[PDB]
Amino acid sequence: KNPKSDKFKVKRFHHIEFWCGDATNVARRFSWGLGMRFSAKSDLSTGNMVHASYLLTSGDLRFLFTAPYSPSLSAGEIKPTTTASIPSFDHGSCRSFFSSHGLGVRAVAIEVEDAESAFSISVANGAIPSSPPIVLNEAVTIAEVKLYGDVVLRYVSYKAEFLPGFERVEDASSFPLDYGIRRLDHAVGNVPELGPALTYVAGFTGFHQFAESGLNSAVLASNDEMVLLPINEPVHGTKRKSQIQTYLEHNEGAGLQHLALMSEDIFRTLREMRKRSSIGGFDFMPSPPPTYYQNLKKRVGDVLSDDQIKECEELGILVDRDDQGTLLQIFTKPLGDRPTIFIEIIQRVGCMMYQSGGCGGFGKGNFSELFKSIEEYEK
Amino acid sequence: KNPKSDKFKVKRFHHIEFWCGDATNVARRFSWGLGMRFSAKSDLSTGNMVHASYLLTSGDLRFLFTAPYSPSLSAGEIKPTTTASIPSFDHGSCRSFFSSHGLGVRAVAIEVEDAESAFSISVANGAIPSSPPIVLNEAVTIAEVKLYGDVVLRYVSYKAEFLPGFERVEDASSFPLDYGIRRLDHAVGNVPELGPALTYVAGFTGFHQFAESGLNSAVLASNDEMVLLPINEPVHGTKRKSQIQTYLEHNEGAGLQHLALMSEDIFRTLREMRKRSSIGGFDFMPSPPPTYYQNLKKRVGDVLSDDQIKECEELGILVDRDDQGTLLQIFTKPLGDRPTIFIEIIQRVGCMMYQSGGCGGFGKGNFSELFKSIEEYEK
Ligand SMILES: Cc1c(C(=O)C2=C(O)CCCC2=O)ccc2ncn(-c3ccccc3)c(=O)c12
Ligand SMILES: Cc1c(C(=O)C2=C(O)CCCC2=O)ccc2ncn(-c3ccccc3)c(=O)c12
Ligand SMILES: [Co+2]
Ligand SMILES: [Co+2]
Numbered sequence: 001k002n003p004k005s006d007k008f009k010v011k012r013f014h015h016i017e018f019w020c021g022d023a024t025n026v027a028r029r030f031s032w033g034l035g036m037r038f039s040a041k042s043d044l045s046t047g048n049m050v051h052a053s054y055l056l057t058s059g060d061l062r063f064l065f066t067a068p069y070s071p072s073l074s075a076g077e078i079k080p081t082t083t084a085s086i087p088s089f090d091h092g093s094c095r096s097f098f099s100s101h102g103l104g105v106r107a108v109a110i111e112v113e114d115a116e117s118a119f120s121i122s123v124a125n126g127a128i129p130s131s132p133p134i135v136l137n138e139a140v141t142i143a144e145v146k147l148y149g150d151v152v153l154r155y156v157s158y159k160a161e162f163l164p165g166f167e168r169v170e171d172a173s174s175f176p177l178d179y180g181i182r183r184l185d186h187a188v189g190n191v192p193e194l195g196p197a198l199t200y201v202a203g204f205t206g207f208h209q210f211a212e213s214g215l216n217s218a219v220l221a222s223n224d225e226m227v228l229l230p231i232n233e234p235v236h237g238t239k240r241k242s243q244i245q246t247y248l249e250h251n252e253g254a255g256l257q258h259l260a261l262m263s264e265d266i267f268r269t270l271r272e273m274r275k276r277s278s279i280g281g282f283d284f285m286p287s288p289p290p291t292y293y294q295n296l297k298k299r300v301g302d303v304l305s306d307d308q309i310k311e312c313e314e315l316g317i318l319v320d321r322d323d324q325g326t327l328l329q330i331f332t333k334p335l336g337d338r339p340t341i342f343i344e345i346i347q348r349v350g351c352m353m354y355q356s357g358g359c360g361g362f363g364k365g366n367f368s369e370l371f372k373s374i375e376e377y378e379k
Numbered sequence: 380k381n382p383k384s385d386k387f388k389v390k391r392f393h394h395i396e397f398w399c400g401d402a403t404n405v406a407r408r409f410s411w412g413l414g415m416r417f418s419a420k421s422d423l424s425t426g427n428m429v430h431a432s433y434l435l436t437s438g439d440l441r442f443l444f445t446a447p448y449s450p451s452l453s454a455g456e457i458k459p460t461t462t463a464s465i466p467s468f469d470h471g472s473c474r475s476f477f478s479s480h481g482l483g484v485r486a487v488a489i490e491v492e493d494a495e496s497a498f499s500i501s502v503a504n505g506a507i508p509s510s511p512p513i514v515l516n517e518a519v520t521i522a523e524v525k526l527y528g529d530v531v532l533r534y535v536s537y538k539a540e541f542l543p544g545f546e547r548v549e550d551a552s553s554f555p556l557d558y559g560i561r562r563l564d565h566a567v568g569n570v571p572e573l574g575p576a577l578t579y580v581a582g583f584t585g586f587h588q589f590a591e592s593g594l595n596s597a598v599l600a601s602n603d604e605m606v607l608l609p610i611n612e613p614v615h616g617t618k619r620k621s622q623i624q625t626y627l628e629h630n631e632g633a634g635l636q637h638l639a640l641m642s643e644d645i646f647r648t649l650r651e652m653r654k655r656s657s658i659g660g661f662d663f664m665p666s667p668p669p670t671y672y673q674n675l676k677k678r679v680g681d682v683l684s685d686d687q688i689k690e691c692e693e694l695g696i697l698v699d700r701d702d703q704g705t706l707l708q709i710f711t712k713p714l715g716d717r718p719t720i721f722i723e724i725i726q727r728v729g730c731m732m733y734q735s736g737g738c739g740g741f742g743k744g745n746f747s748e749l750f751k752s753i754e755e756y757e758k
C-alpha cells in the first residue's frame with residue numbers, strides 16, 4: 001500500500017554531510033576504507049575562510065566532510081559577504097554538534113524539484129526550520145529543516161558542480177578508488193520515542209510508512225520509495241541492553257544510527273574493505289557462526305548457489321528475504337570513537353520492473369536468525 | 380660548546396600526544412600514511428569512561444591520539460575515582476584546545492629519571508605547572524609543565540606497558556606496517572617572540588643552545604643532545620609573508636610546528652609514503668627543481684653517489700650539510716585542515732662515535748639553496 005502522498009516532488013538522496021573536527025583526516029580515512037575518490041573541495045585554497053569541506057564520491061554516493069576554521073579568519077565577514085560555500089554553516093553550531101555528539105551525520109540531503117517550495121510546504125506542515133532557502137550563484141537552491149536530534153533534512157534543487165564555490169579536485173590527488181559502492185540505499189535515525197518522531201517527519205513530508213531484541217522501528221518512504229528513512233526507538237527492560245539506548249546515551253540523544261550503502265557487487269566490496277580493515281579502513285561486526293550459513297540453504301537455496309553461499313560465509317555476509325526479494329547485508333563496527341554511527345553494506349536481489357526500492361526489506365529477520373544460529377551453534 | 384647544564388636527568392623523547400576530536404579516524408589515517416602499527420589502547424573497552432586514547436608505534440617512535448567522550452559517561456567520577464588512564468586529561472581543556480587550534484600536538488613527552496623531581500626542579504626554576512606529578516599503579520610517574528602556547532612538556536619516569544591502564548592491541552587489529560621510521564629526532568615550536576620563549580624553557584630545563592626568508596630560530600638541547608627542541612619566531616615586513624606568521628594566525632597563537640621523524644632508510648620511507656599520498660596517506664611539499672639536484676653534486680658529491688643523488692631527485696628529498704655531518708630531509712604538507720602542523724622525514728649521515736645528536740644540523744642552508752635553485756631553474 002503506497003498512497004503516494006509526498007507533499008512536494010522528491011527525487012533521490014543527494015549527499016550525506018558529516019560534521020568533523022578535522023575534515024581532512026576523516027575524509028582520507030573514509031576514502032581508503034570505502035573506496036571513494038576525492039572529487040570536490042571548498043576550503044582555504046578555494047577562497048573559503050569559514051569551513052573546510054571535502055567531497056568523496058563512489059558512483060552516485062556523495063559523502064561530504066566539513067569542519068570549521070578559526071572564526072578569526074572570517075571575523076570581518078557578515079552573511080551578505082560570506083566566503084562560506086554552504087551558507088547554512090555556523091561555527092558555533094558545528095563545534096556544539098561535534099562536542100555533543102562526536103563525529104556524525106549533520107545533514108541527510110535529498111534532491112527535490114524546488115527547494116524553496118519544499119521548505120515552505122514542509123514548515124507549513126509542521127517542520128521546524130533550520131536554514132531558510134538560499135540561492136547559490138543563481139544555480140542551486142539549498143534549505144534545511146530539523147529531522148531528529150541535531151540532524152537536518154537538507155533540500156537541494158538545481159535549475160539545470162556539486163555546489164557553487166566547490167572546485168573539482170586535481171587529478172594528481174583524486175586516485176580512482178572503487179570497491180563497488182554505488183548509492184545510498186537508506187539512512188536510519190535513533191530516537192527516544194518512535195511515535196512522535198514518525199508523526200513529525202511524515203507530517204511535513206507526506207512520506208508514507210513502507211511495507212524481542214532491542215528496538216521498535218518503522219520506515220518512511222517517498223513516492224517511488226527511493227528515499228527511505230527508517231527510525232528506531234529502544235525497548236527497555238530486556239535481558240540484553242538495547243543498542244538503541246546505548247546509542248542515545250553515548251550520542252547525547254537522537255541522531256543518525258547507520259547509513260546503508262548499496263553495492264553493485266557486495267562480494268567484491270567486502271573483499272576490498274576487509275583487506276583494509278587493519279590498515280586504516282573499517283572493521284566489521286563479528287561474523288555469524290557456521291550454523292547461520294548451514295541454515296542459509298533452507299532459506300535462500302533457490303536464490304544463491306552453494307558457491308555463492310559459502311562466499312557469504314567467508315565474508316561474514318548476512319542474508320534475509322521478503323515476499324518480493326532477497327537482501328545481502330553486513331554491518332561495520334562504529335565509524336569513530338563512540339558506539340554510535342556505523343555503516344551497512346547492502347545488495348538487493350529481485351523486484352525488477354529497474355529495481356523497486358526496498359526490495360527484500362531491511363533485514364529485520366536477521367535478529368531472530370542470528371540469535372537462532374548463536375544457540376544452535378552452541379549446542 | 381655543550382655546558383651540560385640539564386637541571387635533572389633527561390633520557391630520550393618518549394611520546395607525542397595529539398589532541399583530536401575523533402581519535403579513531405586520525406589514528407587510522409596516520410597509521411596507514413606513516414607505517415605505524417597500533418600497539419596500545421585505553422578506551423571504553425578497557426574501562427576508560429573519560430577519553431579514547433590510541434597508541435601507534437614505529438621503532439622507538441610513539442604517537443598517541445586522544446579525544447574526549449561525552450562528559451556524561453563519567454559525570455559521577457571525581458579525580459580520586461577517575462577511570463581516565465591519563466590523569467592530566469580534562470574534557471574542557473581538550474575541547475578548548477581542539478576548537479582553538481584544530482588537530483595538533485598537546486604534549487611533547489620526554490622520559491626522565493624522576494618525573495616528580497623534574498617537575499619540582501622545573502617549577503622552582505620558572506616553569507608554569509600544568510599537571511602535578513601523579514603516580515600510576517605505583518609504577519609510572521607523569522607530570523606536565525607549560526612549554527609554549529597550549530603545548531605541555533610532559534615528564535614520564537618508570538620505576539622498572541606504555542602506561543598503566545593501557546592494554547596491548549589484539550593481533551588481528553595491529554597489522555605490522557613499517558616504512559622505516561624509527562624515532563623522533565626533534566620537535567619544533569612556533570612562537571611570536573623567540574627571545575622570551577628561549578629564556579623561559581632554557582630557564583627551567585637547563586637545556587643549552589645547540590651549535591632573509593621568514594624566521595629566526597634557535598635550538599635547545601639536553602646534555603647528550605638527544606632531546607632537541609628548536610623554536611621559531613616570524614620575521615615581519617618581508618616580501619613573501621612569513622610562514623611562521625601564517626601558522627600563528629591559523630593556529631590561534633603559538634604551538635608545535637613540525638615533528639621530525641628519523642628514518643633508518645629515507646629512500647624506502649619516502650617510496651612507501653608517496654605510494655600512499657593519494658589513497659589516505661600524506662602529501663609532500665612541491666619538489667625542488669632539477670637545478671637543485673644538479674647543484675647537489677658540488678655540495679655533497681663526496682657523500683652521495685650519482686645514483687643516490689638521482690634517487691633523491693625522484694623522491695624530492697632535500698640535502699644539507701654541517702661541518703660535521705650530512706642531512707637528508709623532506710617536508711609533508713600540513714597534517715590536517717589548517718596550514719599549521721606538518722611532519723619532516725629525516726636521515727643523518729656522519730658524526731659516529733652511535734651517532735651524536737643533531738648530526739648535520741636542521742637544514743637551514745636549504746632556504747638559500749632552494750631559492751637559488753628556483754631562480755637558476757627559471758633562467
Ligand atoms: C542494523 C540492523 C538492521 C538494519 O539495518 C535496520 C534497518 O535498516 C531498519 C529497521 C531496523 C534495523 O535494525 C537489520 C538487522 C540487523 N540485525 C542484526 N544487527 C546486529 C548484529 C550484530 C550486533 C548488533 C546488531 C543489526 O545491527 C541489524
Ligand atoms: C621546516 C624547514 C626546516 C626545519 O626543519 C627547521 C628546523 O627543524 C629548526 C630550524 C628552523 C627550521 O626551519 C629547514 C629547512 C627548510 N627549508 C625549506 N622549508 C620550506 C620548503 C618549502 C616551502 C616552505 C618551507 C622548510 O620548511 C624548512
Ligand atoms: Co539497514
Ligand atoms: Co626540522
